[PDB]
Structures are given as C-alpha cells and as structure tokens.
C-alpha cells in the first residue's frame with residue numbers, strides 16, 4: 453500500500469471539486485462515511501474517499517478497512533491503492549470504477565441505460581463471489597447493499613466499504629448497532645453479529661436487481677422493498693408484477709430462479725438461510 457499526502461489528492465481531484473462529474477466536475481458521490489471524487493494520478497484514473505460518531509471510532513473504521521484490504525484481494529472486491537492520513541480529512545485511495553454503484557445504475561442516475569437481465573445475472577454472481585471470499589476469510593461485512601456494490605467497465609461487480617467488518621463459535625452481541633435499516637436482518641437490528649446477516653442483506657440486493665426498486669422509498673407504498681416479499685408469499689401479488697419493466701431479455705424461469713434464491717436468503721430465521729457458498733451455487737445453476 454502507498455501513503456499519500458493530502459494536497460496531492462486535493463490537487464488531482466480539483467480541490468475536491470463538488471461539481472458532479474456528469475457536468476465536468478469531480479464529485480462522483482456520497483457514501484455513508486464520506487464523499488468520493490474522480491481524478492487521475494500518473495495516468496491512473498482513481499477514486500479517493502474523503503472521510504467525514506466518535507473520533508477513536510472513525511479512525512478505527514479506517515484502520516479496519518485497510519486491514520481487510522491488506523488481507524483480501526479478489527476481483528469482486530474493490531482494490532485499495534493506498535491511503536492518505538496526515539491531513540485528518542482521512543483518505544483512502546482505490547482503483548477507479550467507471551460505472552459507479554449498482555444503486556445508481558439500477559436507478560439509471562445521470563441517464564445511463566437500464567441494465568439487461570443478462571448483465572444483472574452476472575452482477576449478482578460476482579457479488580455473491582465477493583461475499584463468499586470475505587466469508588472464506590472469516591469476515592462479516594455488516595453493510596451489504598447496492599450502493600456498496602461498485603461496477604467497472606465490463607460491469608464486474610465489486611464489494612466496497614469494509615470499515616464496519618468483523619471477524620466471524622457462539623452468538624456475538626454488540627451495543628453499537630450499525631448498518632442500513634432497509635437492508636438489515638432482524639437479528640442484526642437487535643445487535644447480533646453473524647455472517648448470516650450478510651446473506652439476508654444480499655437477498656434484499658437481489659430484489660433490487662429483479663425489480664429495479666430501491667430498498668426504501670418514502671414516496672412509495674410500500675416504502676420497504678422487503679414488504680413486497682410478504683405480498684407475494686401471501687397470494688396477493690406475484691414476482692412478475694414487480695419485475696423491472698426497463699428490460700426485455702428476462703424470461704420467467706431465470707427471474708423466478710433468482711427470486712427463489714432471494715426468498716431463501718430472506719428467511720426471517722437466520723439458521724434456515726443458505727450460506728454464501730450455497731447461494732453461489734444456486735446463482736450459477738440459474739444460468
């Protein structure tokens with residue numbers, strides 16, 4: 453890993469130029485824990501994350517991120533080129549992902565074309581492959597969601613944001629409950645820490661992929677994409693009613709097969725959910 457100095461990152465990113473990149477600016481977006489600006493360093497196009505509760509906590513997350521990235525390298529995870537830590541606007545520098553977040557591509561932010569089913573199917577696989585690598589190496593992510601799935605030039609899915617990750621014996625509890633609520637497993641909302649919560653959160657991501665709908669939307673009914681599964685489990689609606697209409701290449705069989713993986717992932721009881729390796733298998737069998 454490479455240590456940088458702050459100014460080098462400011463400079464190259466146009467003094468963290470808040471104007472959006474779709475209009476020649478550099479701001480690519482907002483994370484939960486900071487803001488991300490495009491730039492070029494020695495001809496390498498890059499992403500640099502300006503970090504934004506506790507002072508010992510935010511630091512601890514930065515450390516955890518670098519610790520996870522030092523141990524885990526895989527094509528379905530983001531790649532840390534290095535950091536910058538001397539300015540106290542803490543910084544982490546990554547290889548740049550052109551196609552931004554899955555969330556943003558699912559919404560077609562900034563006018564990008566809808567993703568084909570075929571491409572969605574490989575996105576799900578790659579993401580599952582990324583989570584599996586994490587779990588093989590005894591990490592729980594704790595904030596799996598479509599904004600934390602980045603996408604490169606060929607739409608290779610990569611998992612990001614490892615600041616909340618934990619090592620994966622008995623049930624672990626925490627007093628500090630964190631995550632994104634529209635994605636969180638019931639047990640995670642109560643303060644349990646287990647890899648099984650990552651599977652549930654991935655199930656919600658699979659519903660975003662199938663329907664094109666964000667996990668939460670306050671101007672929608674229901675507000676929570678999760679509630680949709682209940683309407684289908686009760687005979688009230690089918691998955692066909694919610695398939696994203698911004699697609700033409702989505703046959704009933706592979707959609708239903710993906711929905712089947714999703715609903716399995718979404719078992720409200722942690723021990724009934726498949727483990728990530730099982731999820732991987734089902735997503736390959738799907739195609």
Ligand SMILES: O=C(Nc1nc2cc(CN3CCCCC3)ccc2n1-c1ccccc1)c1cccc([N+](=O)[O-])c1
Pocket residue numbers: 473480481482483488498499501530531546547548549550551552553556562564602612613
């Ligand atoms: O590359 C990263 N983020 C990014 N690139 C982007 C490119 C486009 C333009 N793009 C143009 C072509 C068509 C589609 C849109 C639009 C948005 C982009 N966002 C981004 C998206 C959401 C939040 C923050 C950054 C990144 C890489 C590693 C680690 C992290 N991280 O968060 O730690 C972020």
